[PDB]
Design a protein around this ligand. Structure first.
Ligand SMILES: Cc1ccc2c(n1)N(C)[C@H](CO)CCNC2
Length: 330
């Protein structure tokens, strides 16, 4: 089997991407944030505290004839930015772009933190990291990908995120029309439960390539590119007036600037992030200070190849018994 679904930026800055997902019988369609940095499929639901729902589409398990309470199971998750959610668990039928999983754990939110409430366009998250990170207790549950894997033509999914435009998540096949040149594959470590790999280095603009190992994770659920302070300082040093602001919480730059590209290494291959991809606009409405799309990972504990990096590539998440990651230009 295979599946193919379009993913769409939630706003004009590509702060996140939502993908339609069918849950239950008859189908209830929710727009989920596909997140290769976590492993929980959770949704706003009829069980979510009323004051914490503001515009989201909710899942109502009582209206699904295939919904079954997973008796005794609870879940509780906190993400890298301090946001969180928790609740109980149903199993139900879940379909993504024509690909159907029966008995998928659908984690029903009883509580969500403010940043989720304030995000009316995101109805939930669909985790695509390794199932070892799934927070369901006392019986850990499998991701949508993990459950579909054996049925897929090939044990892979691909992320093809658009810049200020829709993109595609495919399951079970590699669309050879979706990229240019060849796909370069690189080793993955699952030891932290992430799609963790090692970049071979970087370049700023038309500058020379610096060979240096940068361990990081491919995370569709993170907006920006977070890299070591050395690398990030080298980038912003090429933008006149750019500076790190503690009050704003990262590098900002004059909105009148033209940003340089940023290149990262994948083995001997190179992925080029155009400068415009690194512009996240005025820090506040009407401001002439703009927020940068490349930031320091120093306060995180891990480097994160988020959407800013990933949207510049066609990315293969290969879930064979020895997982690997593939990157192609497009
Ligand atoms: C993957 C994920 C986790 C938590 C959150 C999230 N995404 N949202 C939608 C955005 C992402 O920039 C930030 C707000 N914190 C909640």
């Amino acid at each position: 089997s295979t599946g193919s679904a379009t993913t769409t930026p939630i706003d004009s800055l590509d702060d996140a991407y939502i993908t339609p997902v069918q849950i239950g019988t008859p189908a209830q369609t929710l727009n989920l944030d596909f997140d290769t940095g976590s492993s929980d499929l959770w949704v706003f639901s009829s069980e979510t505290t009323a004051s914490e729902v503001d515009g989201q589409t909710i899942y109502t398990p009582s209206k699904s004839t295939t919904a079954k309470l997973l008796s005794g199971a609870t879940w509780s998750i906190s993400y890298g930015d301090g946001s969180s959610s928790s609740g109980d668990v149903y199993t139900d039928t879940v379909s993504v772009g024509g690909l159907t999983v029966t008995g998928q754990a659908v984690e029903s939110a009883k509580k969500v933190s403010s940043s989720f409430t304030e995000d009316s366009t995101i109805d939930g998250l669909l985790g695509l990291a390794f199932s070892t990170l799934n927070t369901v207790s006392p019986t850990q549950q499998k991701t949508f990908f993990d459950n579909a894997k054996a049925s897929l033509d090939s044990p892979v999914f691909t992320a093809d995120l658009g810049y200020h435009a829709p993109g595609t998540y495919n399951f079970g096949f590699i669309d050879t029309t979706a990229y240019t040149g060849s796909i370069t594959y690189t080793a993955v470590s699952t030891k932290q439960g992430f799609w963790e790999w090692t970049s071979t280095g970087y370049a700023v603009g038309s500058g020379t390539f610096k060979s240096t190992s940068i361990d990081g994770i491919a995370d569709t659920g993170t907006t920006l590119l977070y890299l070591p302070a050395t690398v990030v300082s080298a980038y912003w040093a090429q933008v006149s007036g750019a500076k790190s602001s503690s009050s704003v919480g990262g590098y900002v730059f004059p909105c009148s600037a033209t940003l340089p590209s940023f290149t990262f290494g994948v083995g001997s291959a190179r992925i080029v992030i155009p400068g415009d991809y690194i512009d996240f606009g005025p820090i506040s409405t009407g401001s002439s200070s703009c927020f940068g799309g490349i930031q320091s990972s120093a306060g995180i504990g891990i480097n994160i190849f988020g959407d800013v990096a990933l949207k510049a590539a066609f990315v293969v998440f290969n879930g064979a018994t020895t997982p690997t990651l593939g990157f192609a230009s497009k």
